Design a binder for this molecule. Structure first.
Ligand SMILES: Cc1cc2nc3c(=O)[nH]c(=O)nc-3n(C[C@H](O)[C@H](O)[C@H](O)COP(=O)(O)OP(=O)(O)OC[C@H]3O[C@@H](n4cnc5c(N)ncnc54)[C@H](O)[C@@H]3O)c2cc1C
Ligand SMILES: Cc1cc2nc3c(=O)[nH]c(=O)nc-3n(C[C@H](O)[C@H](O)[C@H](O)COP(=O)(O)OP(=O)(O)OC[C@H]3O[C@@H](n4cnc5c(N)ncnc54)[C@H](O)[C@@H]3O)c2cc1C
Ligand SMILES: Cc1cc2nc3c(=O)[nH]c(=O)nc-3n(C[C@H](O)[C@H](O)[C@H](O)COP(=O)(O)OP(=O)(O)OC[C@H]3O[C@@H](n4cnc5c(N)ncnc54)[C@H](O)[C@@H]3O)c2cc1C
Ligand SMILES: Cc1ncc(C[n+]2csc(CCOP(=O)(O)OP(=O)(O)O)c2C)c(N)n1
Ligand SMILES: Cc1ncc(C[n+]2csc(CCOP(=O)(O)OP(=O)(O)O)c2C)c(N)n1
Ligand SMILES: Cc1ncc(C[n+]2csc(CCOP(=O)(O)OP(=O)(O)O)c2C)c(N)n1
Ligand SMILES: [Mg+2]
Ligand SMILES: [Mg+2]
Ligand SMILES: [Mg+2]
Lengths: 535, 536, 535
């Protein structure tokens, strides 16, 4: 490795990077020449935004570093949406932002931007390379920052400097710390939490993504104190399945007795969650356990703050928590949960199989039953979040859920599916697309075709910005700009060389979805759904 | 108008705004409720990036304010590429960037970003609304800043504040200054330019977009001092046509004697240009006239700097410039121009009508001949810039050229054509698309269908990132990542409900293009072109 | 508390804030009206830069929240130097940056700046108040972010909004998490460190500020593996005293066998340090333990990275680390260290103690001997860092050292001393000032007089930018712009109403310093020191 471009790629290969998503051009050419000589695969995308989404999804699935790359000015500017999403999701992503020739910086040159400034909000590390040795340092610092969980890292590289001599290897020779530390709470904070639990007659646990490695501990605590368990959308994958305490979700796409259980308990314990809808949370007596102390109390009054890991905190407090024999609150909340879910099933199950346009809730129920027990589900922002949250389950805990749950951008599903599918072509990947989201990055159908990624793109084609239609109904606003003339995505996918099917009959949804999911290759399933569907 | 959302829309309609390009959602809903109750058309796009490009193109065509709007966080984040392009092009654009509810700012809320910080590099004005009266003020300042030529303006509006009471009208009642001032040069700088011209035995004029309102003055000066006229890409629309002094373009996509005339004249005069390729410009004896004094001397050694308008500077100096009777340099440069262009024709014009895959230069020649004399051409960044610069002409000066000439982003052609066509459906709009550029924002074919914009999308389908293929050949780099499996854009357009045709035979290009351009509706013409074809 | 200004001050008082350093004006007036009606003391400063340094120093001394406040535009702009210093030092500081009236934002008004953008690099949290309820939220998030160790927090408050209605109390009622969690390492990283230690025949420990709560563990590990212990400047306060393995410091102001021990050991272990001078560190076999994974390998090749707390990591690995019986390396390094220190004392003690102009090393030795065992020492950036590092010791560990060790700004000593002294007027505070540093913020002598803070300002008056004189000598540059005509700081302090003494005779330094340190009130000691004493 004589040039900085070669040293950068060799360092990524030695770190286990297998693929780089991007689109070649100008200042990125020396870097793509180094990827050509390496054993890293170059994954060409139609729009660099999709490369940043794909890298973020690959990272969420592998737990390892993922990389995207883009040319100068407008090239790396397209990464921004996907970098905000990957950053909010805590993905381990390195973005290679090629930059204009260093001699032209400051001269308002052709394509000039300041990415080293622009990307400061959507990254935990973002610096510009000014030479070989310094480039080697900031590449190490970028990788180490993202592997430590600080979010996206961006390395800005002027094209001429990528062709200059590499550094001496001092920083590229380092081992990267990528382990997960065990964060025990401060004994004083743990004691206050023990006191709050023992003195509450009824407790509710509200779990988020932070309980990922604490399932056994959360269930063990819930059994001891007879607490209903609710979950934020980010914790659904980990705590909803095989859980006899489950009371659902809160917020506008919530369901069941979670809102009641959270607001009626003597004590609410927020476990690894940053659920932002304050109006749904109580203020009277709340505890919060979070690994990042700065996140505690962001969403409601917290009287018992605990900086610590969920599993380690529960292991620390369990011997001091007295077993509660009064289950009346848990039983009352489980009955309320069942009564709410049964009222929906009793009212709507009878005529859903005959309703035209197809009910998206019926599609999601079938998708849950037909998809593999270890499938990856990617979820487009919009009404697909409602269908995923209420109908897609994770029995056996081997399914992965990837979405724009925090940044909330449309169009993530197909590019997320491209990244997730690239990890293992023998694993089923289902993209729950919206017609709005798919239309927004439609050219990524050409990426699916080019790389023959055998993902299953299920389009909930309601010819509408469905979620906006719902917002306007809630606000009392006459609908405007949300519904438009129908689009045939099955014909568009067929024209792009992808196997497709158009589903319009509710009586054929199950069989046609089954055949499409069994097809050994990419498939687009265009389902004509009701834009006004809601239970 | 009780709410700030209604006051904002009423202010835009009083300014003559006819359309807003965008995609509705969350915090933008109160604003679109006001647009619903107004004269303004709501133009739904598939990706907000296309709304920012469309607004920029509409503004370049009308010379008036154009508006784009987007929802909070990820919605307005998508405007960024189009805002950089509109800003670099000097478009008069207002971007309505809806923002998260004000009570959630600073709480790392769902969809939270800081657009009021993010858009500072791609705008001349960018501020956040925090109340009704203050919102009315910054709406005025944003419009006034962009109408005065300071580039894009961004107004960031938290959704809840759009529903609050409007201001009292003090700033919305103002007349906006949109006139063009006449910037005469400092007499000392003009005197130095007069002296430099009279002492030079030979002069060359190199013109850019700044000569837009100075054609008569530039030609009058060129006739008096017998100076060849070359041009930067941004000035091509204005000075190339009906010009007996024309010696072409400079830079890598240049042609003709422009580089010789610029480097051999006793004095080179840069007129309204910021041509960035320094290696092609002389350093010895250069004058520069620019309306923005900060731009002077950015690209080469300038000995005679002049802060001033091109037309006003030329009118100021003309009575003091002595007529040059010696035409030798002009004639020698016009002959050099012809010798350079004839060497290309002698080498490459051999069986072009039979070359397979179709030669893109042949397609561009035919497009130049068949398109209307007042057509709008939008140009995708890449090899289409080469075909546009060398083969699309502007006889009569009634054609408009819109492209990403300064920001250099791919995928601008179709969204620019959507904005340009929306101005007047009876005017022909031709989009010169690249397969890479069209694939990058492919969903905007659904926007063309939805609004039935009768534009003609000509896809130079070379199954390649053509320009990158050329860069790698020049740098001595083995080709990689540029060429990919073929895509049928005609079938994709047909599936999207747009009339289309696929052209693979060079003997049918002329007739099939003629039929497509005559069709009264949107058409996509997918032309399979040679990725290796180039006349050097 | 009806207004947001009152709610803000009530929230700070409920958090235990006793003082606010600042300078009143325009948009800050409603806030100082609320301070007037509270138990919080208002500490008027001459320059808002000093208020930010004072808050940072108070926080480093108490381990609790400290607050500074400034008026709109130019007022809060003056905080910036002190906020960079407090941020780099990890101080727990809240800066109240008053802002122009909200109706004028975006109109290029009189005094308009964008502090909510300007202060992003010198803070972990920086947001603008736009209403009562939102102001209450961001005040909580700012306090919680700084109390969790994320650095300075800035709250930007338009003056008119400070007078508007307060929020409902939801976020102000929260308990703030200020505990210290116990971070155990990932077992795989700890196992690699155990293997590296057991395979090394000789080990050296290089400690920084991160070993503050790990003294016992560091000494315990050092005894087991017979390792010399060196330290970075930030760790001097904690690991230098009562340490039989001590081999000094590294870098240009270093001394003793630290550089030799670090570079000759088979394994170097970086413990809680971010020492930036890479040229003094080895590259061949280095381990690093840091609580922030992003900091690992920033300064040299790290082969054994460990994300974890120093004390918890050592407790975790100790039972697996074999006792090293070979003491040869330790004894060789301790003999080298002792010979280096004793040789200097034997050779120079007489010339330094009698030298005219007074030798600054003699002044620092006297200060070490005469100052209380629990004194606070503040250190001005420049040659005073050399005198502090080499001669001020911390026997019993009850002294505090405050300086601009990371941001490296001049003029911090007197403002740091004002903050440290304000905590407890019965505790001795010694400010080691430079003539350049004191002259830079000379008006703060009026603050010392106004508040009668009984600190002892020792001016090392060498009529020079001493450290710059040394830089130019090392670079081979002819001296220029460093030395200027003598200033009489004792006469200036006397004119400002402060008790002062001018010391020019080395035979009187000890006696006159003893009298000055015993004086019950503020004292400025102007010592004419040798400008050619460059260590
Ligand atoms: C259209 C749309 C609508 C939405 N509607 C809703 C809705 O109605 N209901 C809903 O529930 N969601 C909703 N969401 C998502 C919502 O905005 C939030 O993103 C989500 O609820 C947060 O999930 P979380 O708390 O699991 O994850 P995060 O917000 O990522 O929080 C995880 C937290 O755990 C902490 N943590 C991580 N590891 C550990 C550890 N080991 N120990 C302790 N703490 C740790 C992190 O620091 C963080 O604070 C919606 C999303 C979309 C796109
Ligand atoms: C792929 C690609 C390749 C390119 N290759 C080339 C190439 O080889 N050759 C080439 O020519 N271009 C090339 N371009 C474009 C090139 O980068 C520049 O953007 C362009 O040449 C600048 O044109 P301009 O000077 O007319 O406009 P601008 O750069 O916009 O400059 C116009 C100037 O006029 C000034 N001005 C405005 N109004 C007035 C007035 N009334 N009076 C006086 N001054 C005024 C402005 O302040 C400004 O400084 C390329 C573009 C692309 C996309
Ligand atoms: C004029 C001047 C000259 C200087 N010259 C020198 C010189 O020659 N020599 C020198 O030594 N210094 C010198 N300094 C200071 C030097 O620049 C550094 O600031 C200093 O050496 C860093 O000290 P540190 O590593 O202890 O602290 P920091 O740089 O603050 O690093 C402490 C580290 O410990 C980590 N940490 C914190 N808590 C824990 C925990 N519980 N467990 C594990 N890790 C934890 C932190 O994450 C951080 O990485 C100079 C300063 C000045 C002003
Ligand atoms: C980039 C972007 N633009 C706009 C929005 C606002 N928004 C959120 S959901 C939604 C509608 C999504 O439509 P579609 O993808 O068809 O999903 P549906 O709700 O109809 O299932 C919109 C406009 C957004 N989140 N991201
Ligand atoms: C958003 C963006 N990404 C990348 C580039 C770099 N780039 C400039 S031209 C080009 C190739 C364009 O391909 P296509 O649109 O097919 O045009 P062609 O040159 O093949 O005619 C590329 C990759 C860019 N300018 N903008
Ligand atoms: C604000 C600031 N300006 C400049 C410097 C550069 N600098 C570092 S130390 C120093 C000299 C300090 O002089 P003085 O305070 O008299 O201390 P001395 O070295 O003479 O003891 C200078 C100029 C700095 N660190 N901070
Ligand atoms: Mg939809
Ligand atoms: Mg192409
Ligand atoms: Mg000095």
């Amino acid at each position: 490795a004589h040039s900085y471009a070669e040293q950068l790629i060799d360092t990524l290969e030695a770190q286990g990077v297998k693929r780089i998503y991007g689109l070649v051009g100008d200042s990125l050419n020396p870097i793509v020449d180094a990827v050509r000589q390496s054993d890293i695969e170059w994954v060409h995308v139609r729009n660099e935004e999709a490369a940043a989404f794909a890298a973020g999804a690959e990272s969420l699935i592998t737990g390892e570093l993922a990389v995207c790359a883009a040319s100068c000015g407008p090239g790396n500017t397209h990464l921004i949406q996907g970098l905000y999403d990957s950053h909010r999701n805590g993905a381990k992503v390195l973005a290679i932002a090629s930059h204009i020739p260093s001699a032209q910086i400051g001269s308002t040159f052709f394509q000039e931007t300041h990415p080293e400034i622009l990307f400061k909000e959507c990254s935990g590390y973002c610096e510009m390379v000014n030479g070989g040795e310094q480039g080697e340092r900031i590449l190490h610092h970028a990788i180490q920052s993202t592997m430590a969980g600080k979010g996206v890292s961006v390395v800005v590289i002027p094209g001429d400097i990528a062709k200059e001599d590499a550094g001496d290897g001092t920083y590229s020779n380092s081992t990267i710390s990528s382990g997960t530390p065990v964060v025990f709470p401060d004994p004083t904070e743990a004691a206050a939490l023990v006191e709050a639990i023992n003195n509450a007659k009824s407790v509710t646990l509200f779990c988020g993504a932070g309980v990922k490695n604490a399932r056994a501990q959360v269930l063990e605590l819930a059994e001891k104190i007879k607490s209903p368990i609710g979950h934020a959308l980010g914790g659904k994958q980990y705590i909803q399945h095989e859980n006899p305490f489950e009371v659902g979700m809160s917020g506008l796409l919530g369901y069941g007795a979670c809102v009641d259980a959270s607001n009626e308990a003597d004590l609410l314990i927020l476990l690894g969650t940053d659920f932002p809808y304050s109006d749904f949370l109580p203020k009277d007596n709340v505890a919060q356990v979070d690994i990042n102390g700065a996140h505690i109390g962001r969403r409601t009054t917290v009287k018992y703050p605990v900086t610590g890991d969920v599993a380690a905190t529960i292991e620390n407090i369990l011997p001091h928590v007295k077993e509660k024999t009064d289950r009346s609150f848990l039983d009352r909340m489980l009955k309320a949960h069942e009564r709410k879910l049964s009222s929906v099933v009793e009212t709507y199950t009878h005529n859903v199989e005959k309703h035209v346009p197809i009910h998206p809730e019926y599609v999601a129920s079938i998708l849950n039953e037909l998809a593999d027990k270890d499938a990856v589900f990617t979820v487009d922002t919009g009404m697909c979040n409602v269908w995923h949250a209420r109908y897609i389950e994770n029995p056996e805990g081997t399914r992965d859920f990837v979405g724009s749950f925090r940044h909330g951008t449309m169009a993530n599903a197909l590019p997320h599916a491209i990244g997730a599918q690239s990890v293992d072509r023998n694993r089923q990947v289902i993209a729950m697309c919206g017609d709005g989201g798919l239309g927004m990055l439609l050219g990524e159908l050409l990426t699916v075709k080019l790389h023959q990624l055998p993902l299953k793109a299920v389009v909930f084609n309601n010819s509408s910005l469905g979620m906006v239609k719902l917002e306007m109904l809630v606000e009392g606003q006459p609908e405007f700009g949300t519904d438009h003339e129908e689009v045939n995505f099955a014909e568009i996918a067929a024209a792009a060389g992808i196997k497709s099917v158009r589903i319009t009959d509710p009586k054929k949804v199950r069989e046609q979805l089954a055949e499409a999911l069994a097809y050994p290759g990419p498939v687009l399933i265009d389902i004509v759904t009701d834009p006004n569907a809601l239970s």
